[PDB]
Amino acid sequence: FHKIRNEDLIFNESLGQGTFTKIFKGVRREVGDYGQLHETEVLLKVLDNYSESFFEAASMMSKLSHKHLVLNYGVCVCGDENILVQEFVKFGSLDTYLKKNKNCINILWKLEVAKQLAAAMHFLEENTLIHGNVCAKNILLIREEDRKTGNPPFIKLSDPGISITVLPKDILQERIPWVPPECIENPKNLNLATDKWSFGTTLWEICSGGDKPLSALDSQRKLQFYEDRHQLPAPKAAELANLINNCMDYEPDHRPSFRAIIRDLNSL
């Protein structure tokens, strides 16, 4: 990663937290193209020991440029804290957007977002790179739909974060049902098939107005939910329900490739 100086970063408002990270909007002073000076909005992700895992994952994905993958500017390793400096996306995380706009999101919008997300996962699948934390909070909305201009919404997938292969078991349990059954029994089972399961969970989120599946269940009950091989309920808008269940297959080898997923998406 390109190294950025603490002196060139200004921290502004907190935008929340993630798994062992705090999120801030900020401004980076930089020399850009043609030597012009810029003050650029940036997203700063701050590691509050786990630093190696967070930066390795973001790094390996930033080796692959793609229109549906988030852009990382570099890191700030100055001082005491370790900071990832990332493009600032105008409309934030999808999960809060879905909740703040539930009454105005229709199947055409959902299918366009599902197709884009699958296009990103297909690209990762072809490059044999595992994301490991596909969820609606990690979908960034770049631009909203404009039914005037007929322009569709546009999303990007955010960086993987700390790998489930190093997170404490009780955080992994709280991430059920995004983390697949085989990773709960062993996080070292992390595989390309892992992302197919979480992709199904994310389609469920996309269809449920920002509800978190199984949120009423405490950690012990989430474990028992996998133990009994339950599936998620079909959302009220059930147009994607079959795809969701096809993706959340308890047999990882039976989960369909993202090519087949895309073909299935196109058939609607």
Ligand SMILES: Nc1nc(Nc2ccc(S(N)(=O)=O)cc2)nn1C(=O)Nc1ccc(-c2nc(C(=O)O)co2)cc1
């Ligand atoms: N690049 C970027 N740009 C913006 N912009 C923005 C715009 C508006 C708003 S607001 N307040 O008006 O709604 C908020 C933000 N946000 N952003 C981003 O990466 N956010 C983000 C942070 C953390 C996570 C995440 N961490 C985990 C984990 O578990 O570790 C799981 O997900 C996911 C996404």
